[PDB]
């Protein structure tokens, strides 16, 4: 991530991450609406961190440094470049909605009223259909993904060494390949966690809360799909086996 | 410190994400509670032994069935979780949740949790629970699924009050340790 970006999200809540004098002028209903907003906000932009360290310190290190088989780099990092676009992507625009709202004069101090729009736009149309063939292409080889990894890590030295090197910094602890993957996978089950709490606290205005309503209804279509697009590949899997259960 | 996985799994009412938030932070949130865990990797040292425990959450995953399996690979030790104050929860354990991780977790020991002890003995929970011809769950209720289910033990906790949580996950550390 980008310092600016760190430090706007640095807070546990937005709460706490405006001033006091601003916080304290809006209505209790408005801060339990923004707190989750910023917590998708800051999520989002700690998954975009989670695809960097998989492209730029892990696939881009073992392309540097070791000798890999061919086709052995992008096993252990299935469509991670596309990933990277689509929430690269939603992240700028959110990260936009919250730029356009600051109040002038101030880097910290924003409301943002209307949400809803914005997820719409990102779970409909092409931006949706991108996102689901990419998961149901990732999520079907995320276990050779794993699998690819305890074998290179336990018989070649220099692949070993290499990841002892790169996650040995603290704020790396959570962040180990495997660990990457998981996260990766585990995202797209958050957002409707997260979306049907904003919409809790987003009755006030009546478009918005239809807004969210039918954001809340395409992430959940965008997911069935997904699950119903997995079967896991499997390295070495004969046909036979693939096509009985 | 060797490093173990955890896992917990149960019904979206049992208060897994809380319970996560709660140990990782060792404090229920003053402000703010968070709506969802990423991951964790907590310093434990249990019984003179040094571990790093990588926590992860299923919310969000229980209606997705090719999803939510994902979760489970080279996990060491499952907590599975069930609210004090939803019988309902408890009644999902042993046909729903208790083949799913004994098909994709084979061997690994399972801690049976009973969350919201805190509820028991709270008033307002008795009485919406008495309109539905039901009663927070007992203890004894709660040992006994343990048994039933091949549990490797039965804990309580409060994400609320803090009490029984670091119990909990260091028990899991223990039983993650074991051959
Ligand atoms: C590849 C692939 C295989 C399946 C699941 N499957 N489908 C059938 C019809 C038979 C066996 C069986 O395993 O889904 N994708
Ligand atoms: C094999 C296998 C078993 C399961 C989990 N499961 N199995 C049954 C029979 C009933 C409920 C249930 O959750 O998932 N895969
Ligand atoms: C139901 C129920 C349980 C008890 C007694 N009791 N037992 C324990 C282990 C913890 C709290 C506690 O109240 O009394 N009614």
Redesign the interface.
């Known amino acids: 991530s980008m310092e600016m970006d760190e430090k706007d999200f640095a807070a546990?809540?937005w709460?706490?991450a405006v001033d006091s004098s601003f916080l304290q002028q809006h209505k209790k209903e408005v801060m339990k609406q923004q707190?989750?907003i910023y917590?998708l906000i800051q999520?989002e932009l700690?998954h975009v961190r989670t695809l960097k360290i998989m492209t730029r310190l892990f696939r881009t290190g073992m392309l540097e440094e070791l000798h890999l088989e061919p086709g052995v780099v992008q096993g252990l990092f299935p469509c991670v470049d596309e990933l990277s676009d689509i929430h690269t992507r939603f992240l700028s625009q959110l990260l936009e909605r919250r730029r356009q709202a600051l109040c002038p004069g101030s880097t910290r101090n924003f409301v943002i009223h209307r949400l809803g729009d914005l997820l719409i736009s990102q779970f409909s149309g092409p931006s949706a259909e991108q996102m689901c063939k990419t998961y149901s292409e990732f999520?079907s080889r995320?276990?050779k993904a794993?699998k690819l990894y305890k074998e290179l890590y336990a018989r070649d030295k220099r692949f070993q060494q290499f990841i002892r090197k790169v996650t040995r910094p603290a704020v790396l602890?959570?962040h180990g390949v495997?660990?990457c993957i998981?996260?990766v996978?585990?995202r797209?089950?958050?957002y409707?966690?997260?979306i049907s709490?904003i919409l809790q606290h987003s009755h006030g205005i009546e478009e918005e809360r239809q807004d969210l309503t039918t954001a809340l209804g395409l992430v959940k279509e965008l997911?069935?799909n997904?699950?119903?697009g997995?079967?896991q590949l499997e390295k070495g899997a004969r046909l036979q086996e693939i096509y009985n259960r | 410190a060797i490093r173990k996985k955890l896992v917990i799994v149960g019904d979206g009412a049992c208060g897994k994400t809380c319970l996560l938030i709660v140990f990782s932070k060792d404090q229920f949130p003053e402000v703010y509670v968070p709506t969802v865990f990423e991951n964790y990797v907590a310093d434990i040292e249990v019984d003179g032994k040094q571990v790093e425990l990588a926590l992860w959450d299923t919310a969000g995953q229980e209606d997705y069935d090719r999803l939510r399996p994902l979760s489970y690979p080279d996990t060491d030790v499952i907590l599975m979780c069930f609210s004090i104050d939803s019988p309902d929860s408890l009644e999902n354990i042993p046909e729903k949740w208790t083949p799913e991780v004994k098909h994709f977790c084979p061997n690994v020991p399972i801690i049976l949790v009973g969350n919201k002890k805190d509820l028991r003995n709270d008033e307002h929970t008795r009485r919406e629970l008495a309109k539905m011809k039901q009663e927070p769950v007992k203890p004894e209720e709660g040992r006994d699924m343990a048994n039933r289910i091949g549990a490797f033990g039965y804990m309580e906790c409060s994400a609320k009050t803090k009490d029984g949580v670091r119990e909990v996950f260091e028990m899991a550390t223990r039983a993650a340790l074991q051959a």
């Open positions: 546990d809540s709460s706490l707190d989750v917590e999520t700690h999520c995320h276990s794993l602890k959570r495997q660990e998981l996260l996978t585990q797209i089950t958050k409707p966690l997260l709490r997911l069935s997904v699950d119903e997995i079967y």
